[PDB]
Structure 1
Amino acid sequence: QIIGTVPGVEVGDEFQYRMELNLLGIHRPSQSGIDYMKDDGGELVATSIVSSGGYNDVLDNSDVLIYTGQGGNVPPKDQQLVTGNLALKNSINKKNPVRVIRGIKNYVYDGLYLVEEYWEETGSHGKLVFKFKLRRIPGQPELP
């Protein structure tokens, strides 16, 4: 469970399957968009996320990414501040890097990001959704 850059894995590096990410230690979950662990105080923190179209994420060509939280069937219900969602929230204060893998060879490693903030939105269904603002840490190579 590495935080930050993983040996041998360069920005721009591509992969065909979620499990290749698992093998390399990039992203563990087979399916879940968010991977996390415990810190040196047992609070949850985020290590990596996947944005592959599973939700309505905002992936322009900028250093900022809006990542939707997980859950809530997205019969609709409120997303919840536990697990990955929680991990991501905590990662704002912890200011730790988070690997970002983007879907498109179906996945590219996008580099490191910090979680700057989060908020709740209320969708059409009437239920709660989380949104996380991640900014790409400066100084890294660029992905075409």
Structure 2
Amino acid sequence: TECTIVPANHFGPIPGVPVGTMWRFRVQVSESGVHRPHVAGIHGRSNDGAYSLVLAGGYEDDVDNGNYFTYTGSGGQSSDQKLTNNNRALALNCHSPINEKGAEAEDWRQGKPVRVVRNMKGGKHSKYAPAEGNRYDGIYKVVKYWPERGKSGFLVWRYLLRRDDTEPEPWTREGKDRTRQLGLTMQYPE
């Protein structure tokens, strides 16, 4: 059943789903409303913004630093990516006018929020990935985005996101203490 407590185009935290929430399977992640697409790694609308993303490995030039991370858009390498569809959505989140050249946020915190989920498949490059399942790590914002052409010569769209959430990161001592207070357990299908 699709999440109905908030609309599909809801920006920001999902009511009742705290930072640190864990689900074994993507279908539960979707049903919770935190990341609606079952398979795709980003949810957005090209004229509104990006609502959520799942970090599951992605590309080799991406680096996960926990409180911040870099990220690569979709499409294309055999052809150029374009600042359309979800690449555009994510760029629109940045506190800056949309720019085919890339842009940096004026005040990054005034950007539209992005719900970030880390999935265990990211553990092959990131020490922040959960060992199992999927974990909601809170709200991040787009600090900047830019195009680049790597070894294939084709263009990819790149993003830097930084955490802006009042609850601590689940991997920290403070996060672990919140997980305890909230009684968070790996969630399974009922």
Provide the TM-score with structure 1 as the length reference: 0.86
| Distance (Å, rounded) in 2 between the aligned partners of 1:5 and 1:123 | 35
Contact 1:33 1:70 in 2 (8 A): no
Question: How far did residue 10 of structure 1 move?
Answer: 1.4
Higher strand content, 1 or 2: 1
Percent identical pairs in the alignment equals 39
State the partner residue of 1:58: 63
Question: How far did residue 138 of structure 1 move?
Answer: 4.8
Task: Select 1:129's aligned residue among 151, 156, 168.
Answer: 156
The DSSP-based 3-state class of the residue aligned with 1:20 is helix
Q: Deviations over 1:73-110 (max 9, x none)?
A: 5xx21111111100001111371111001112321101
Stretches of structure 1 that go unaligned for 5 or more consecutive residues are none
Task: Select 1:45's aligned residue among 38, 43, 49.
Answer: 49
Task: Select 1:114's aligned residue among 141, 152, 156.
Answer: 141
Task: Select 1:32's aligned residue among 35, 40, 60.
Answer: 40
The DSSP-based 3-state class of the residue aligned with 1:49 is strand
State the partner residue of 2:115: 99
What is the one-letter code of the residue matched to 2:29?
Answer: L
Q: Specify the structure having the higher radius of gyration (Cα).
A: 2
Task: Select 1:90's aligned residue among 80, 89, 92.
Answer: 92
Question: How far did residue 121 of structure 1 move?
Answer: 1.5
1:82 to 1:122, Cα distance in 2 relative to 1, 3 A = same
Q: Deviations over 1:21-53 (max 9, x none)?
A: 110111111221110147xxxx23110011101
Provide the TM-score with structure 2 as the length reference: 0.67
What is the one-letter code of the residue matched to 1:102?
Answer: R
- 1:23 to 2:31 alignment: yes
State the partner residue of 2:167: 140
Task: Select 1:77's aligned residue among 58, 69, 79.
Answer: 79
Contact 1:27 1:49 in 2 (8 A): yes
Stretches of structure 2 that go unaligned for 5 or more consecutive residues are 1-7, 96-109, 121-131, 172-190
| Distance (Å, rounded) in 1 between the aligned partners of 2:135 and 2:142 | 19
What is the one-letter code of the residue matched to 1:4?
Answer: G
| Distance (Å, rounded) in 2 between the aligned partners of 1:106 and 1:131 | 26
The DSSP-based 3-state class of the residue aligned with 1:92 is coil
Task: Select 1:14's aligned residue among 22, 41, 54.
Answer: 22
